[PDB]
Amino acid sequence: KAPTMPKPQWHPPWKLYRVISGHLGWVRCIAVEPGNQWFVTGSADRTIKIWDLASGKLKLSLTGHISTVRGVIVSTRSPYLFSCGEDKQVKCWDLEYNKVIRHYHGHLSAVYGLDLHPTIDVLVTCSRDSTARIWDVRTKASVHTLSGHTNAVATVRCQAAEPQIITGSHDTTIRLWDLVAGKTRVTLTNHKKSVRAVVLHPRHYTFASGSPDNIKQWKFPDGSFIQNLSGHNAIINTLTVNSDGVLVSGADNGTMHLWDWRTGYNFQRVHAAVQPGSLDSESGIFACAFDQSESRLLTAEADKTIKVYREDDTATEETH
């Protein structure tokens, strides 16, 4: 009865292969190197530690922040592992000497997330004081103050296709602030909850979006609501999408619901376990991003255990 019901997309279920637990505190960010060798992941212990992307062993430990590290954006166009700390300091720890090289400032409060633009030499630092900041890389100065949010700008997206910068505001209103002007070119007539999640699928479609309650898709030219999300009412914090058509949603309740970017039905919708030292209701996917080789999924939970989920071939998972 539903449109496009008997022809969904293909999505085999995944399986956890290794649960690395070396950090001391809730991991708030996780990122993979573009060479598929390093895995940068912060923690609540104010130490952004890099590990092996495939072996899983520890590779380095780089501290320096005065608060929780809630952002780690490894730059692919330049060797600089920039990080956003909650101590009002976007510590751009360059990996050329494993130390701070820039130490840019300007935000009045904690920084929510950071995203490096693929084309423009600037870093979109989504702060949480009242707005975001367009920090210029290798200049140590801000470009423009894109103040278009009534609350903290949690999510951030710097796409080369979208001319504006998609900012995710916690005031239940997403915005697309232009890079040259700075004003929000178009708002979002959706996401009734506090929107603190955003994704992008540039493989064969436009960039989507997300929300904790009543999430929906979008489009890159000026926004276009394609379809809403499934029955996921938990507080979503991680939203990753692969080029093969997989859509991973990481919520705070631990229910890592995996759906399709085209079909929309939840393929796996499995819930992860917790650490023995942790509490009963403490496991929650705060950050999740796929690998550079798009083989083993990586989700950093809140139970101080960076879990890695590999793939597995199966055929008895037909959805009605």
């Binding site: 637990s21 001391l24 650490q275 023995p276 030292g277 942790s278 255990t305």
Partner: protein
């Protein structure tokens, strides 16, 4: 030979009675190796 005759306890041969050391991390910060050493070294 014949140097330890009145020894009550012969040999313990067990430091932690489960392994040579802890070698296991836990999310509980109080019941970990960090708080066990900080309550034994700095405190007395």
């Amino acid at each position: 030979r014949r140097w330890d005759d009145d020894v009550v306890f012969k040999n313990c041969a067990k430091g932690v009675d489960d392994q040579k050391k802890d070698k296991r991390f836990v999310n509980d910060t109080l019941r970990s190796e960090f708080h066990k050493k900080f309550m034994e070294k700095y405190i007395k």
